[PDB]
Amino acid sequence: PLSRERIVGAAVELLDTVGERGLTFRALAERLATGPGAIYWHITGKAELLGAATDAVVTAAVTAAADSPQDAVRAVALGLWDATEAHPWLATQLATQLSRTPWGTVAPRIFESLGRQVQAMGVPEAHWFTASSALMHYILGAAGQNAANSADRDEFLDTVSTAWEGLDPDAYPFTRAVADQVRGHDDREQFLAGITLVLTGITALHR
Amino acid sequence: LSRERIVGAAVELLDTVGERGLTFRALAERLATGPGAIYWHITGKAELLGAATDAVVTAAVTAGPTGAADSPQDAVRAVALGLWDATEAHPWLATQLATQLSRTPWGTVAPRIFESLGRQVQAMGVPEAHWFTASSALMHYILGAAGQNAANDEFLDTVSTAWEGLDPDAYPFTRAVADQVRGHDDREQFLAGITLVLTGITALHRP
């Protein structure tokens, strides 16, 4: 029969194949193989279903205490990074979740995950919010761009490297100097280096 | 029918009717010029969006004056605030930057931002092996915070109270900072996060 996981699982599958716009009453009802005149017992609105789908995917990626706070933050970030990689629509829903969904359940859970590590890192209470939000914003920006790219990467990077090597050496001394480095650039490694950079800044806040 | 004119027109349209509202007729009409001769100053929509994004970014980043005691860190902040304020004045900007860094290998905005950030990274004494890493991290951070800012005072209060409703035993951290959500200034958060990244970057220099 119709359960929670089922409803959500169905929307996720649809979001992965047909996207947001493809997530409709009929589509859901059909994939669920249940009567449309009795599905109101397990659903409410589309906005709420998108939230439940976003939440289910995030929770699963992040959760699926013996390591350092820094490693724990990395597991949280990779969970988000891999999830938005497996589900392209996820990145968009997270932005909407933090912009127009005050009662959203995903935000506070991510914030709890990151915050506990920030406190375990010895960060003064006056910076708990700041440090946690920075980690979050960093994650969304890198993972957001990664999702945009997952919407070939080695070919795109090779064309960028080429285009930059064609820039005037006197006008762009830095960009010309790094152009070569763009070629074999790995996004995942860059992501984790960025995380470490942020964590290093946070660790310096210690007392 | 100058360059600035064409671009200025698209920006005005992008600000009022958005991307979808940026059409041949709209541009031609606002330009008050014959549509049968505008091919001399335009190419495609993709290229026009890029020129519009570039014009706005260049103007914002080089806008304000430099400070009498500006260090590399301050300069990076000026670049970031220029981007933050620009995406705030032009909502469509955030989306164009993502597309610019995902499908526009020959784009001109990316290398210019990277040149701006890179020179400061070098001035900070960052080993050459990390020039791209450090620069990309700043960029990803900026896109993530500014991107979220583009998406979204009334919201913050709702979030603050909503979070204050979370179970205190399950969400010890979130509950501890809950109230800080209200009156939380996004702009200051933005600058604090960039400073956090810059602190991590400054630790890349070795005596």
Automatic annotation (TrEMBL), chain B:
One of its GO terms (molecular function) is transcription cis-regulatory region binding. GO terms for biological process: negative regulation of DNA-templated transcription; regulation of DNA-templated transcription. Residues 1-60 form the HTH tetR-type domain. Keywords: DNA-binding, Transcription, Transcription regulation. Residues 23-42 bind DNA. InterPro entries: Homeodomain-like_sf, HTH-type_TetR-like_transc_reg, HTH_TetR, Repressor_TetR_C, Tet_transcr_reg_TetR-rel_C_sf. Pfam families: TetR_C_1, TetR_N. This is TetR-family transcriptional regulator. It comes from Streptomyces coelicolor (strain ATCC BAA-471 / A3(2) / M145).
